């Protein structure tokens with residue numbers, strides 16, 4: 144019989160998922176493989192019922208995939224249902240795969256999607272490969288080299304903020320833009336720098352391993368006041384949602400409205416419910432609205448996951464999908480498909496999943512780097528040297544209707560809070 | 564006295580010129596420099612008259628540059644007027660640069676623009692010259708894959724234009740022959756074609772022989788059409804690099820400009836811009852294939868890409884180039900080019916980028932031996948070496964073109980020796 148290749152998506156979508164599906168499917172079909180796609184990740188595979196999976200499994204033919212490289216989202220949907228936890232759920236998945244005569248199993252998704260594939264992984268009977276998916280640019284790819292979907296997300300964010308930059312200057316106002324995603328500051332920083340935003344704050348720039356609510360308020364506050372000292376009572380500040388995952392007990396308590404933070408049954412805090420931008424706007428309007436400043440929060444997140452892929456991501460995901468089929472052919476299994484140095488190569492599971500955490504390592508922003516310093520130079524902010532500038536402190540202090548003494552007492556310490 | 568930074572653009576525009584302008588201007592202003600922008604490149608500096616120059620130079624203030632990083636084009640315009648030739652013109656350009664107290668001089672442009680900048684350097688510690696390599700074509704000798712600024716914006720817009728044409732050609736069955744402007748290299752054409760899933764792309768790099776024949780290009784497109792026809796599809800999109808023309812033989816060019824002699828500029832320099840490659844191919848192919856019910860339409864993609872607003876990748880890129888230029892002036896550099904390699908912006912020295920024979924910066928073509936190119940080929944529709952040996956397939960494609968399999972092989976099988984496999 145003709146070998147069967149089964150494909151699914153797990154976790155949250157990123158632009159280009161359809162590109163991976165098509166890159167693997169079209170090439171597979173050129174070899175005479177039957178391709179099937181599982182709807183909603185492992186959701187229905189975890190049940191083990193064969194006719195339930197068949198009913199949520201589709202034939203991925205030429206016509207179905209021929210033009211989805213233009214399309215955001217995933218045509219086979221996705222789910223966060225991961226069997227990684229239970230030994231039984233795993234057995235249920237294998238039963239359906241074997242019943243479907245799946246010879247080649249391809250998963251596209253995040254950390255939990257790959258752990259599911261490895262737990263479910265007879266290399267001659269099957270072969271399993273995951274394609275690491277993250278919009279956040281936080282794979283340990285050789286620094287600079289992006290993860291797929293990141294270019295699409297950064298570009299669309301840049302366009303959204305451009306409109307906000309025009310609206311903020313046209314009708315003076317500050318926007319606090321919350322960039323969804325707590326893993327890393329790549330998306331926040333890229334949108335901000337691309338767009339020329341007047342400030343960006345990411346968790347990586349804070350020296351201390353923990354962040355205080357009031358230091359974030361004061362960081363944005365000083366920028367507003369400096370801009371105001373230059374006659375501009377408007378701007379745009381981009382905040383990475385990860386700021387909240389680095390906040391202290393007390394800080395988190397202020398963030399949730401000076402109330403005990405919400406809690407899941409196991410004690411793990413439910414950080415999704417926080418509203419970092421809405422909170423900072425509240426506090427800032429208290430301190431600053433008496434100067435003629437208006438402040439409005441704005442979230443950017445969900446509109447980015449399924450935007451149509453930009454051309455870089457189109458080419459990227461076509462090469463990733465092809466590279467999956469090449470790994471399958473050349474006998475690989477239990478490996479991850481990544482592009483490093485213009486080559487798509489299967490990096491083995493062990494050789495890329497950090498066994499300490501039991502998960503692929505996280506690439507954060509490098510704030511010691513030349514790139515980060517350049518971005519900082521076009522932001523509006525109070526540097527160390529700025530604070531030691533008697534004449535400058537006099538104008539910004541005047542801007543905020545306070546003495547130069549109070550200004551230094553309040554803000555000068557921030558040089559020790561974030562890297563210079 | 565505050566130092567004077569002078570800026571100008573030469574050559575054709577590429578998305579992100581304003582990004583470089585603003586990246587450098589804003590940082591220079593954070594240091595207290597005066598910054599001026601010469602309008603239309605070297606056009607008004609070659610004259611040497613200082614009143615006329617003063618008229619076509621502007622003060623690059625904070626408010627002029629603060630938001631242009633969103634904007635395509637160049638706010639100080641550009642020009643191909645290169646003083647690289649006559650030594651009189653070069654003393655004139657230097658009389659105004661020295662008359663304006665221009666301490667630092669930044670040019671943004673291509674080969675002729677940098678060749679111009681260098682020649683005027685060869686001038687006392689009173690001036691320091693730097694050029695910023697610009698090309699939409701991606702043909703700078705940067706480490707492989709790494710792009711020149713403007714390429715991403717151009718490739719992306721091209722993918723969007725071709726997407727519309729892909730929908731149109733399938734909705735109302737038709738073939739489009741898209742001509743991607745630029746004869747330097749195949750990067751732009753291949754990138755647009757691959758991102759868009761175009762059914763064929765043809766670039767000069769993929770042809771083995773130094774020279775190309777008109778009839779080989781026709782037949783390459785013809786085989787793809789016929790193969791799609793044999794799979795039920797009388798429609799598609801084919802992307803062509805305009806650089807096919809610069810590789811054509813005398814006999815090929817003779818057929819391209821009609822069946823006449825090619826036009827010549829004085830001194831024999833052929834006038835290749837007048838060619839209409841995709842229109843010519845479209846003519847010939849409708850002679851051969853129209854009886855099969857095939858419609859074929861040329862479409863050029865080119866000028867709409869030069870001044871598109873830059874995508875985020877290019878906004879960041881040009882911000883970093885503009886910063887890196889100021890940082891280089893500050894460190895006492897001069898006679899250098901600003902490039903980004905391995906994520907760092909560094910001033911490569913001009914002597915270490917200029918090929919000897921050509922005198923200009925090494926040209927980086929498409930690497931057709933790479934995995935990248937092979938991957939792009941697999942999603943194209945075409946007859947491979949193996950396909951020509953497949954008997955059942957050759958019988959289907961020949962029937963689609965209403966010929967015997969022997970007439971099909973005699974006409975097309977030799978194309979496996981024309982382009983790399």
Ligand SMILES: Nc1ncnc2c1ncn2[C@@H]1O[C@H](COP(=O)(O)O)[C@@H](O)[C@H]1O
Pocket residue numbers: 373520521522523524525592593594595625
């Ligand atoms: N934090 C900042 N970020 C970007 N530009 C600034 C900043 N502070 C001042 N500028 C600009 O830098 C230039 C120098 O201003 P001054 O400090 O008055 O010499 C002016 O164009 C200011 O608007």
Ligand SMILES: Nc1ncnc2c1ncn2[C@@H]1O[C@H](COP(=O)(O)O)[C@@H](O)[C@H]1O
Pocket residue numbers: 172173174175205790794941942943944945946
């Ligand atoms: N040159 C080509 N490029 C891309 N796909 C092709 C090409 N030729 C055939 N196909 C597709 O490959 C699959 C298998 O073709 P076949 O070998 O005829 O079964 C079908 O979906 C065809 O439409």
